[PDB]
Amino acid sequence: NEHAKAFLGLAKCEEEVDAIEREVELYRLNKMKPVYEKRDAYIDEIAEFWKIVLSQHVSFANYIRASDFKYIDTIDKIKVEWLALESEMYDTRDFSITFHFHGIEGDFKEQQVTKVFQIKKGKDDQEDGILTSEPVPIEWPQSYDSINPDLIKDKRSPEGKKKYRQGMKTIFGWFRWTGLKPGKEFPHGDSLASLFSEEIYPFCVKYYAEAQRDLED
């Protein structure tokens, strides 16, 4: 066959590869579900887990602040949950995660929150493959009104733009994260989407048992 016609067909294979990419993940959304549900059903019957596992992770080094751990300790529950068999609006390669915080009394409200996440790729337009999200409404700490972006008086200042640069690095500025604001939102916030849903689970039970350990190295 002529190269003129053979190229037209090869392009349709590169487009069938990305359609297989959705099918092999639809099979993930179908076949994993009974060990996703079993796993969830054990963390609804354990009293508390996430306020033990997360701080010990070698990659958690990259993400969450000395000051912020007083707020993420109040996490009761974390669940990851898919939409694409319940909704036309979302790809099988997109996902959401749910948190539930008990709060600090007169400081940080008791709240359940969900953030959604969606994958981008070169598709006709060869823009760089990245993970992205929508901003979520969250109740910020009262102690954090010096670094809460919404109470900064003036973001031009040598103190005001540094208080903004602090504030955007919190776990609460991660809830405002989107993936789309270079140097203007939570850094590495995509890899925090992966850590709660996937990169935690290979070690969290090592880590739960490690905090039960009384022996010494």
Partner 1 sequence: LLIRKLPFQRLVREIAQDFKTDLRFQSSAVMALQEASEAYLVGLFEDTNLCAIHAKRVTIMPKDIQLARRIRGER
Partner 2 sequence: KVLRDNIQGITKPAIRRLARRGGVKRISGLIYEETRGVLKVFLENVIRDAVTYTEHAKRKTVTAMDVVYALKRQGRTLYGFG
Partner 3 sequence: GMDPNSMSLNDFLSSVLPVSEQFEYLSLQSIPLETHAVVTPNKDDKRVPKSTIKTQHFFSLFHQGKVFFSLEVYVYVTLWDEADAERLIFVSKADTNGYCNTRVSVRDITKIILEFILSIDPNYYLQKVKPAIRSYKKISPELISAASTPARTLRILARRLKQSGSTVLKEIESPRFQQDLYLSFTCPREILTKICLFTRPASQYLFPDSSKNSKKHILNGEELMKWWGFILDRLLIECFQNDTQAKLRIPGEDPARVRSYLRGMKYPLWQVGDIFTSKENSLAVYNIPLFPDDPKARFIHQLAEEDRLLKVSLSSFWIELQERQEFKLSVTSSVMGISGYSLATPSLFPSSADVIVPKSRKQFRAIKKYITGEEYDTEEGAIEAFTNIRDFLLLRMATNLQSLTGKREHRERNQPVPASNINT
The residues that touch partner 1, with contacts defined as CB under 8 A, are 60-66, 69, 162, 166
24 three-class SS: helix
**Residue from 91, 119, 121, 213 binding a second copy (CB under 8 A):** 213
Among left, alpha and beta (phi > 0; psi -120 to 50; other), residue 195 is: alpha
Backbone torsions φ then ψ of 215, nearest 5 degrees:
-60, 165
**Partner from a second copy, partner 3, partner 1, none binding residue 216, C-beta < 5-8 Å depending on class:** partner 3
In angstroms, what is the minimal distance from the CB of 56 to a second copy? Answer: 15
Based on the shown chain and the rule CB under 8 A, indicate whether residue 216 belongs to the binding site for partner 2: yes
Q: Token match 């008990």: residue?
A: 102
Site string for partner 2, 131-170 (x = CB under 8 A): ----------------------------------------
20 versus 61: smaller Cβ distance to partner 1: 61
Q: Which residues bind partner 3 (CB under 8 A)?
A: 3-5, 7-8, 10-12, 14-15, 55-56, 58, 61-62, 65-67, 69-70, 73, 122-127, 158, 161-162, 165, 169, 203, 205-206, 208-210, 212-217
Distance, in Å, from the CA atom of 69 to the CA atom of 164, rounded to the nearest integer, reads 19
Tokens for 181, please give them.
């604001």
Whether the CB-CB separation of 141 and 104 falls below 8 Å is answered with yes
Q: How far is the CB of 14 from partner 3 (least distance, A)?
A: 4
Nearest CA among 173, 139, 207, 171 for reference residue 69: 171
Q: State the angle between helix axes of 3-31 and 33-43 in degrees (0 to 180), rounded to the nearest 10.
A: 40
Phi first, then psi, for residue 212 (nearest 5°) are -75, -15
- Give whichever of 86 and 127 is closer to a second copy, judged by the CB atom: 127
> Residue 102 contacts by C-beta under 8 Å, 6 or more apart in sequence?
74, 75, 76, 110
Q: Is 120 in the site for a second copy (CB under 8 A)?
A: no
Residue ranges that bind a second copy, judged by CB under 8 A:
1-3, 6-7, 9-11, 13-14, 16-17, 19-21, 23-24, 27-28, 31-32, 35-36, 38-39, 41-43, 45-47, 126, 128, 201-202, 205, 208-209, 212-215
